[PDB]
Design a binder for these strands. Structure first.
Lengths: 414, 59, 110, 296, 192, 205, 205, 198, 102
RNA sequence: AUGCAAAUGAAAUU
RNA sequence: ACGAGAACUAGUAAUAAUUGUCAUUUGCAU
């Protein structure tokens, strides 16, 4: 297993033992939750990995004090990540349900960490103003950033490197944010007789464009869904590594995205991304500088949308049939019934919306996606046969707690 | 012991009317006095409700 | 206005009573509906003769009794009748009927 | 350097993308093209008013208050009420430009921003087979604007005196044709008056380091690279058809054009140009990009 | 290239019902007073003149959707209440609009259903203005001949809805022909 | 394209109570305060009477679907086979000649018939006051005919003639079998106001 | 579809006094100021007469619910039934012949007859004045008949002559118990104004 | 339901003064200029005489409620109960033989009676005038009895016989106390016109 | 009618003391004829001559009224309506004579 | 010639 | 050389249907 995947699988279950400790009927090690969780997780063939068990059992200062682990052992990172992140029978029922899902639904593979995240999210969403689910996700995201930063900076002796405040003070974290331009005019450019059908499909079309963009981005960076903090409308936020490689790759992906978007509409939708450094000390609400850095990245994003097109871009833009009845745009090339190819695909996806629930990203599909892909519609049996499946308060507030507030708002509105 | 039945002519005349108009109002007061003289209950109704002064006031 | 009230309330007329006008009232009332039946305002000569006989009866009744004589003299009935005959307009006759009726209703009130 | 004041007294439709859309202020593309079409209708000589006239976009007015489009400047403080604000009155123009405008003052200014109302009028179409036989009617909706009795739009123009006198002649001729969307349908007639407001002229005659573009402009090929050194600008895709070029109106359409808006700020002035967006046409179709600057 | 301005006043013989609102009637949203929109004038005029027979219509009113482009040579705008009718009604204390209660009779059941419809009060005056932009010197007479018949036809027709059932008749008074831009004489054309 | 105008006057035989207002009043203009004869009432009374003239079947009774020819004169254009109207029935207004006559001879324009509505057993004799336009009043009316088909004019006129005739032996308004609202037609006039079609061979009794 | 007209003359045997307008006036027109007999009371009286001639129950008397054939003849259309009356009744107007006769013989059209009432155990009289039409007067009347069914005329017409008979030995108007309102019918005429039906074997006594 | 007519003649014996036109005239028909006797008079006299003939309580006098037999026979419908008169009384007119006999014999139809008055303690004679209907003349009348119950018909007819008797034994019109009003009945006729009931 | 009586008031005496009691028979004569023949009018004339012979004042009253030519013309006309008009005239004379008395 | 100048009730159902 | 351009808020249908100004009460005491 790639040590990043070991980090992921350990951190996402780093503080699981609490659910056993408060269970009361499953309290094998009533001394500590760490040893108890280690013992419970030591029962399963799929999760029979040893380093994940070490991670889970070794997330606290006293526990790490005598474990005699190697200088390069992932659990220490989990330590800092945990530090960075900051009736009984029901719990027994949760133990039974989790054992069932672990024996029958969970399996260990390179791409199965999303499965662990999805099931844990299904299960712990209201298990404590902080749920355990948010805690595990944020711990995992922070560990991801930390591990990438230390491996990139040629640092391996983390036990001597960390096991502290100066590392807290190092700007090893990066805030990147994305912004979609033309929500309103692209969503409200309908004049045909299929107003409801077109409208409902265009809204989901834009939403899925955003989701596929974020998925492609996270995949390319080898990063996981834990590091995503909020997506919606057009605003979406990621916490990524503050490394030169990361910044370069961000640049390149941004360039390619802009090239495509110029290739598609040229005005109607455009994406702007902006990134700014921060240190781990700022995420702990040390001096409220967290709101400051957020407002700063907001200001940066607001002030990069001014100069959007360089000289050559516009120079081409000026030097190069009629308007679709349904889609108020002329540039796109119309066909039978005066309807364009993409908007006709919109009509098709609208017709397929009501009866089908799964959407599959593939090479041929029906609708055109950013990175030379397409989106089509399938059924759960068809999905299995194929086996990506898609099924002041912000600022001022009162990372984990604003993240969970955003998640609550999103879940309420969704 | 007043009855609306004893008011009929007066009501009728009102419905009829509802410088010659000044003479019509004078005839109204004439018939008003006549009705008050005919029946004592009508006399009390007209006198105590200030019918004559308001009739003069309108005229 | 109440010109009828002025004379009635002032005087009753040396013993005047309502039945002492019956035929006179009767005669007037007769002419009333007669005056109603005509269409044009111009008074026909037969109606003129009716007016004249009404004047004659007025004088005879005034001579018969002193109290009625005092009423008719004090209410100026004879000059009014003469002017009415002179003018020969129906509307003035209807107004005369209204005035005489006001006199009668008042005199019955007291 | 005189300015013209326009009163409408009739509903007028401006149009952005569809007949149901309504706009209150139009850009110098529509106005200048109106000037061009009325000049051609007059049969006048066009060179004089083509490469010698300077025209700005149109801006709304009230009983006695005048308005300019917002400057897209970087103010360092809410970031919301300013966004909710679209126009700036002349009285506090420099106050905003020197930041002497407060949040409550902006709120008040937005409050006094009632300068007319928008409407959608329904209609039917019985030129269809309802003329012939059984066929349902084809309703549509149109957008119109109605101004309060003391409102309208005003221009700013500058140039030589002969050009300006010709401009007055063109303005008289145009006052009885239209200036909007569905003009021939009963929308968009107006009467003009020429007024010289001292304060507006004084604002016009300042001197500074920045520049505020009051028209629709687009730099030529060879200077833009020097024009865009430090800027805040907004693009607006200008598309649309043309009048009296080729056979089919549906077949004829101006090539898409991209241009700077009327709130942009620049460091290095550029003189613009009238750019042809014509192709497969019997005459060139000109789009206006020549800047009228406010230097403060 | 000159401009002829053709103005006058028009009376409401029988109640009128344009009523895009319905069943209410078209108005202005602040003055709360009726208008008769110029599109409706145009539609009725187009219908009558076309039913009269084409090239004269297309030139007069403009189509430019049939493979050729012609610009409309006539502009019609809205009309409004005159001051004279306004003061006349205000002094005489007459409301501007009438409300008629109607009924519909079912057969074989003979049950009656009510209706409630607004109409213009009869006799009112509206002041109207048309503009004719002369682009062709040797045709305007014929064009004005057409416009003559236009009002003449509309003279014996109705405006708005329910016209056959007995409302919408209008009248035209006080027509004068004036030139205000250009140097073309306007003393020989006549509109009744 | 010719339009034909019919002008004439309607004379009240006995009291008329059209009465769209509801003291059981009659419709009145707000400019002159005079009796009026609404066109929708005249048109629909003639329409119903001419429909019930010929065949009017129960299925025909159900949907207000009627004879093709009366449908031609009055217009239906409701479902499928559209037929746009052909007769615009204009109104009658209280004439000024009778206005002068009555003003000279001092006659009001409206009488108030006082009646009774007795029942059985209980026999509640409720007094009533119905307002009516006094007899002798005259109204001026005009009708408009569009010639959608030249050769069909005569029969069209023929048909409306029958309508005139039938209405002359009938009533308008309410309380019809109780005596109210009999009318007569007088002093007709037919003229093709617009167009080139001669209207000499026409007569309307 | 046809309309059968019944024309004739009402001769007032003794006094007649409707007095709807009320010393105590009679109902009179305004254009000529001559007495008239409305259709309304005529209809109500004949209807109650023919109802009593046939059945009339207490539950029937409760809410004007009557025998079926009388309902067909006079129309109710209340109990969810389609029943429009087939009989239109006119008002009756003072005729030309009678007015001429009273002109050439100098006889007024109206008498004011005085009555007395004697209170019990008081022997004090209260006088009254009632305006009534002088005898020998004649009015004209016209009746209108609707043929809703071809197999339903004569029998209803039989009833109608029966109804007429019930009138001829009764009173139309007020106070008939005290001897006024006796009438008679003369000069009956039966014509079909509109249609293709025969009115030759049809008679009303 | 049925109708039975009653036809007959009343003969005047004394003076007859009805004077509805009231120096003191008599009612006259304007189509004939001859006096008549109102149906109201016959009905009112009859009703009074029969009410006196039956129970006449002081309270009933105050409330004008009539005896049930009289109330049914002539109709009151005044106490809130529906009560339609079963009997109809009309006016009455001169007979042809009456007029012929009077015209042939040069005898007038009205008699002028001077009434001389003597005042107590004063003896002042102020003559009065009155007109009377000539005795020996006969009038023809008509009553109508409508059948609503087939059984009580005989009771009503007997009560009508009592009516005729009492009216023959009393006075009709004015001047009853001083000797005007004595009339008699002759040639009573019963002949049903409508119905099968006789 | 009124004119003759008011203008015959001489100094006061009316036709030298004329009194309605002396007109009684004449009054009665007219009264009977009022209820109602040419010979009857002749006897009316005879009674006029009789009553004018009875008193000189009455003879003057009848002469100053031009009664005899009036009666002759009434007889010549033979019209009952003119007879009634003369009755009205004589009644007016009698009334005014009554009015102007001691 | 003398008393008499009125008396009492009463919108419904679609 | 103006998101332009052609575009009657139409067309069918009414206050309809049943209901009595009637029920009693003397032109007459002196």
């Amino acid at each position: 297993m790639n040590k990043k995947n070991i980090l992921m699988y350990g951190s996402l279950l780093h503080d699981i033992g609490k659910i056993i400790y408060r269970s009361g009927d499953h309290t094998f090690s009533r001394g500590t939750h760490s040893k108890l969780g280690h013992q419970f997780l030591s029962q399963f063939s799929e999760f029979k990995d040893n380093e994940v068990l070490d991670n889970v059992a070794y997330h606290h200062y006293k526990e790490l004090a005598k474990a005699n682990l190697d200088n390069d052992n992932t659990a220490y990172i989990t330590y800092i990540a945990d530090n960075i992140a900051s009736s009984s029978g029901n719990y027994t029922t949760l133990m039974k349900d989790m054992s069932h899902d672990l024996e029958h639904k969970l399996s260990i593979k390179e791409g199965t960490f999303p499965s662990l995240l999805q099931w844990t999210e299904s299960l712990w969403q209201y298990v404590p103003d902080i749920s355990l689910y948010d805690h595990s996700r944020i711990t995992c995201a922070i560990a991801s950033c930390i591990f990438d930063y230390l491996n990139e900076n040629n640092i391996h002796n983390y036990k001597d490197e960390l096991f502290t405040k100066s590392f807290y003070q190092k700007e090893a974290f990066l805030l990147l944010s994305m912004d979609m331009s033309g929500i309103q005019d692209f969503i409200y450019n309908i004049s045909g007789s299929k107003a409801l059908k077109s409208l409902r499909s265009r809204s989901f079309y834009l939403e899925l464009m955003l989701e596929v963009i974020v998925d492609q981005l996270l995949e390319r960076l080898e990063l996981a869904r834990a590091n995503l903090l909020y997506t919606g409308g057009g605003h979406a936020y990621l916490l990524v590594s503050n490394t030169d490689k990361v910044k370069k790759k961000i640049t390149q992906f941004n360039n390619e995205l802009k090239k495509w978007f110029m290739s598609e509409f040229t005005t109607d939708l455009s994406l702007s991304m902006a990134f700014e450094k921060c240190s781990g000390d700022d995420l702990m609400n040390t001096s409220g500088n967290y709101r400051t850095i957020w407002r700063n990245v907001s200001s940066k994003l607001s002030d990069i949308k001014a100069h959007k097109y360089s000289a050559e871009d516009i120079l081409k833009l000026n030097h190069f049939d009629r308007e679709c009845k349904e889609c108020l745009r002329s540039d796109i090339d119309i066909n039978d019934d005066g309807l364009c190819s993409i908007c006709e695909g919109i009509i098709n996806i609208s017709n397929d919306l009501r009866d089908k629930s799964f959407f599959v990203l593939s090479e041929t599909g029906k609708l055109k996606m950013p990175f030379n892909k397409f989106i089509s519609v399938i059924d759960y049996e068809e999905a299995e046969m194929l086996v990506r499946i898609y099924s002041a308060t912000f600022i001022s507030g009162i990372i984990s707690r604003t993240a969970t507030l955003s998640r609550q708002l999103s879940l309420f509105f969704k | 012991g007043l009855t609306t039945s004893k008011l009929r002519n007066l009501m009728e005349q009102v419905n009829r009317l509802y410088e010659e108009f000044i003479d019509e109002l004078e005839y109204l007061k004439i018939k008003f006095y006549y009705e008050a003289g005919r029946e004592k209950s009508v006399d009390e109704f007209l006198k105590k409700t200030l019918m004559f002064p308001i009739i003069d006031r309108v005229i | 206005m109440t010109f009828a009230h002025e004379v009635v309330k002032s005087n009753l007329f040396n013993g005047l009573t309502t039945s002492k006008l019956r035929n006179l009232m009767e005669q007037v009332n007769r002419l009333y509906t007669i005056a109603f039946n005509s269409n044009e305002d111009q008074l026909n000569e037969e109606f003129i003769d009716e007016l004249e006989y009404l004047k004659i009866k007025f004088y005879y009744e005034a001579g018969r009794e002193k109290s009625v004589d005092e009423f008719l003299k004090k209410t100026l009935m004879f000059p009014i009748i003469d002017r009415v005959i002179k003018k020969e307009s129906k509307k003035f006759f209807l107004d005369y009927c209204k005035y005489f009726e006001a006199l009668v209703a008042y005199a019955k009130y007291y | 350097t005189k300015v013209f004041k326009l009163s409408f007294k009739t509903p007028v439709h401006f149009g952005k993308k569809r007949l149901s859309d309504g706009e209150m202020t139009i850009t110098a593309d529509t106005l200048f093209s109106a000037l061009f079409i009325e000049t051609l209708q007059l049969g006048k000589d066009t060179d004089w008013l083509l490469n010698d006239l300077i025209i700005s976009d149109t801006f709304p007015y009230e009983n006695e208050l005048y308005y300019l489009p917002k400057p897209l400047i970087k103010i360092d403080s809410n970031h919301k009420a300013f966004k909710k604000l679209k126009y700036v009155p002349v009285h506090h123009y420099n106050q905003y430009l020197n930041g002497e405008l407060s949040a409550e003052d902006a709120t008040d200014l937005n409050d006094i921003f009632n300068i007319g109302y928008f409407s959608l009028q329904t209609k039917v179409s019985l030129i269809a087979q309802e003329t012939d036989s059984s066929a349902d009617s084809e309703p549509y909706s149109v957008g119109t604007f109605t101004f309060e009795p003391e409102a309208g739009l005003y221009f700013i123009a500058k140039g030589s005196e002969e050009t300006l006198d010709h401009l007055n002649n063109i303005m008289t001729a145009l006052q009885y044709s239209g200036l909007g969307g569905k003009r021939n349908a009963g929308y968009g007639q107006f009467e003009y008056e020429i007024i010289n407001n001292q304060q507006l002229s004084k604002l016009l005659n300042q001197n500074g380091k920045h520049s505020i573009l009051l028209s629709t402009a687009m730099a030529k090929k060879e200077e833009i690279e020097s024009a865009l050194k430090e800027a805040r600008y907004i693009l607006t895709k200008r598309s649309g058809f043309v009048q009296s070029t080729n056979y089919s109106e549906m077949l004829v359409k101006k090539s898409d054009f991209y241009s700077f808006s009327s709130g942009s700020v620049f460091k290095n002035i550029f003189n613009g140009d009238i750019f042809n967006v014509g192709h497969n046409g019997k005459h060139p179709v000109y789009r206006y990009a020549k800047p009228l600057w406010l230097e403060v | 290239y000159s401009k002829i301005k053709i103005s006058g006043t028009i009376e409401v013989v029988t109640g009128l019902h344009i009523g895009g609102g319905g069943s209410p009637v078209v108005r202005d949203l602040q003055t709360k007073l009726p208008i008769i929109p110029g599109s409706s004038i145009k539609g009725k005029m187009r219908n009558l003149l076309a039913k009269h027979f084409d090239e004269r219509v297309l030139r007069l009113f403009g189509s430019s959707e049939k493979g050729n482009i012609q610009r409309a040579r006539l502009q019609i705008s809205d009309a409004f209440f005159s001051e004279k009718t306004k003061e006349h009604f205000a002094q005489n204390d007459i409301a501007y609009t009438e409300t008629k209660f109607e009924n519909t009779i079912n057969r074989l059941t003979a049950v009656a259903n009510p209706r409630q419809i607004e109409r213009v009060t009869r006799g009112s005056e509206f002041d109207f203005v048309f503009i004719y932009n002369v682009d062709e010197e040797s045709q305007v007479e014929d064009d004005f001949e057409n416009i003559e018949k236009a009002i003449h036809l509309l003279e014996n027709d109705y405006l708005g809805g329910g016209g056959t059932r007995g409302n919408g008749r209008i009248q035209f008074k006080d027509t004068n022909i004036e030139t205000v831009v250009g140097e073309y004489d306007s003393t020989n054309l006549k509109i009744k």
